[PDB]
Amino acid sequence: PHTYIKTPTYREPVSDYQVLREKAASQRRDVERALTRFMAKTGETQSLFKDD
Amino acid sequence: PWYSIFPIDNEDLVYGRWEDNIIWDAQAMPRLLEPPVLTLDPNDENLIL
Amino acid sequence: HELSVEQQLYYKEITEACVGSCEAKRAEALQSIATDPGLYQ
Amino acid sequence: KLKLSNTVLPSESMKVVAESMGIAQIQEETCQLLTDEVSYRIKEIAQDALKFMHMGKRQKLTTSDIDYALKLKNVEPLYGFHAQEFIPFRFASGGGRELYFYEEKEVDLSDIINTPLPRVPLDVCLKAHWLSIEGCQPAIPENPPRLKPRSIHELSVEQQLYYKEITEACVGSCEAKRAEALQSIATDPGLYQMLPRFSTFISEGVRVNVVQNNLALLIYLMRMVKALMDNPTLYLEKYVHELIPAVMTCIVSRQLCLRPDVDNHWALRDFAARLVAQICKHFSTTTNNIQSRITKTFTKSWVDEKTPWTTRYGSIAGLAELGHDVIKTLILPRLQQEGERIRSVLDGPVLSNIDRIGADHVQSLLLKHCAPVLAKLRPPPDNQDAYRAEFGSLGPLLCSQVVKARAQAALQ
Amino acid sequence: ICKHFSTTTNNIQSRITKTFTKSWVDEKTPWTTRYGSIAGLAELGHDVIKTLILPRLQQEGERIRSVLDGPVLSNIDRIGADHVQ
Structure with a gap:
């Protein structure tokens, strides 16, 4: 049944609370550091150290 | 391969006629363009939602 | 879906730095866009 | 609109027949009377031979339809002769006369005996297949052909599983698995729309497979390329820009693994690569893009001073398999350089390197090509010491190779 | 952007060359847009200017029609034409 039939596939979804917390945390830290x-x-x- | 082994390409780039957003002549523009709303595609990873 | 205030402020400052008030803020904004790790979203 | 006419045979052919029989001085009304009678009988039979074409379910009037159309009109199907008594052959078709307009009209009677008879074809057999499975026609070879929504891959999961099985079989863990997977690549009609992922798997593979010179990984990928090429359904010249630098790398690259021993396969890795390279220059050909580009890279690989000898041997093979004229016009002004390279490998004692093996392979290949290049454009006179004017590389052994080629030509 | 992102599923470079080509070969196009078409096609690479630019080198004659001999000299076509040249 490559010849008469077919079905769709999707992308792998990342529903994990640990990696979602890590992604949101690291993206917030990186955007506030860049800002x-x-x-x-x-x-x-100003600078805590001389010419820093 | 119940979930995709290969990545999924941008359907708009692969299929859409983006060439229709090129402004060839500013005054003589063949069609009328419209403001574009943000669509936040969720297929892209690296976006929380 | 709606940008947090941090990145909303970052978006505002980076876009208004590339409209043409001065060149040095523009160069630092382009060097921010080119060299930051978390600018997705 | 229908401008249908009534075409008859010409009367100036009917007077030629009459005066070549003994009936001279025939009038034009006498001669026109012959050519409307016989042109009706041709029209009466060809309309009657079209009944046998339709009844036999053919769209081509064969030669036997007129034999049955004549027998139907009580005229003997015999064309060459006419038997007044009719008793030796009674309405029996002799199959016509195999005659031509451009024929020789005289043959030798032992030419017809000494020619080989044609092969009797296979007898009629009954094979069954499937035109439709519950409404859908299968693609078997017996058949002819605001958040944006979460997108789906353009391959099905049966197709993606098929790609995974074919690629994991084509890395050659088991040989029967490879061979089927190679035949599956060679004749799957639906292997288009999966072909970007196959081309990318080949290209990416060779480049991270020459980081460590893994010969099987490469011999399997080259066989996958050869199985991709002879598939007639898929359109390949959109992907040949990835296919060609992969094969050039198999032919012109150094071998990171053990230099000797598998060099025998390495020659075949360069043999399979040069075969598929000249097959790719045979197909996909437009003006001055593909064949001349690989020819220029092969020649600047050759004229480059102090090459790797693996690269040298591979490029030599690649320029060698390019056809009749290419060795006729390119290998000619370079024999002295080849001889000097052979002499340097010979003089320097260094034997533990691969230089000596590379030199022997290059010299043997060049000598075989030079042999027919010579057998092809000159007589086989003075085959003893005239080749000493070409530095005496192959000499009498080259002459013996030319003699073997002449014997093969005599056998043909 | 078409070196880093063109894939055979994308067809970015072929679709960019086709827009540049049918903007260049087609007449009535202004000298600015012809300049842009020639500039993009010539930044794509060497084989593109072999098989796109070099057939229409006779178009330079049509350009020099309006440069070495123009009835109107004080128009803005001359600076764009010799920039294209």
Whole structure:
């Protein structure tokens, strides 16, 4: 029945609470790190260390 | 292979005529374009929802 | 489906940095877009 | 609209027949009287021979239909002769006369005896198959042919499982599994729309399979390419841009695994690759794109100084299998370089490298090609020491190869 | 974008070359859009300019019709034409 019949398939769904918590956490941390580095680079900046 | 072994391609790129969104002449535009709404395709991974 | 306030603010700052107020903020915004790990969504 | 006419045989052919019989001085009305009578009898029989065509369920009027149409009109089917008594042959068809317009009209009587008789074909057998399975026609060889929605792959799960089984059989764990999978690739009609995934599996495989020179993995992939090519249904020249650099890599690459021993297979890896390479230049041909591009890469592989000898042997084989004229025009001005390379391998003592094996294989292949290149364009005179004008590489042994080719031609 | 993403399921590069080609071979197209078509086709690679640009090299004569000898010199066609050239 490659010759007379057929049926569709789908992509593998990731319904796991652990990896969904990890994905949402890491994406939130990365976007807030990118936002704060962009705003500290395009403005007046301070530094805990000398010339940092 | 109950779930796909191979990845699923962008149906719009593979099938749609995106060539119809090229603006060849700004003044003489053959059709009238419309504002596009965000569709948030869920086929793409790396999107939480 | 709706961007969180963090990434809503990041989207606003990055898009308004590439409209042409000054060139240095534009270069830092393009160097943000090119070199950040989590810009999906 | 119908402009149907009544075409008769020409009267100027009927006067030729009459005066070649002894009936001279015939009038035109006498001669026109002959050509409307016989043109009716041809029209009466061809309309009557079309009854036997339809009854036999054929769309082609065979030669036997006129034999039964003549017998139906009480005229003997005999064409060559007419028996007044009619008793030796009574309405018996002799099958006509095998005669031509462009014939020789004279043959030798021992030419017909010494020719081999044609092979009697197979007898009629009854095979059954399926035109329709509950309404659907199967593709067997006995049959002719806002969130956006979650998309489905363009292959079915039977098709995806088939692809997985065929690819896991084509990596050659068992030989009968390979051979069926290769025949399945060679004659599946529905193997289009799966062909991107097969081409990508081949291409990607050879490139991560030459990182470690795994000869079987490569010999199986080349057999998969050969099984992909002879399938008549699928359209291949959309995918040949992935297929061709894979085969060039099998032929022009160094071998990371043990240099000797499987070099015998390595020559076949370069033999199978050069076969499929010249089959790909035979097909898919447009102006100055494919054949000339691989010819240019083979020639700059050859004229490159101080090559890897594996790459040298593979490129030599690749340029060798390109046909009649290619060795007639390319291998000619290069014999001295080939001889100098052989002399260097011979002089330097180094034997534990693969240089000596590469040299022997290259020299043998070049000498065989030069033999017919010579047998093809000159007589076999002075086959003893005239080849010493071409550095004396193959000489009398080349002459013996030419003599064997001449013996094969005599057998043909 | 068609080096990194063109796959045989995509047909990105063939569909981009076809748009550029039927924009270039077709007459009535302005010198700016012909400049864009020639620029994209010539950034695709060497074999593309072998089999697309080189057949229509006679079109340069049709260009030099309006460059070496133009009834209207002060129009904007001349700068675009010699940029295309």
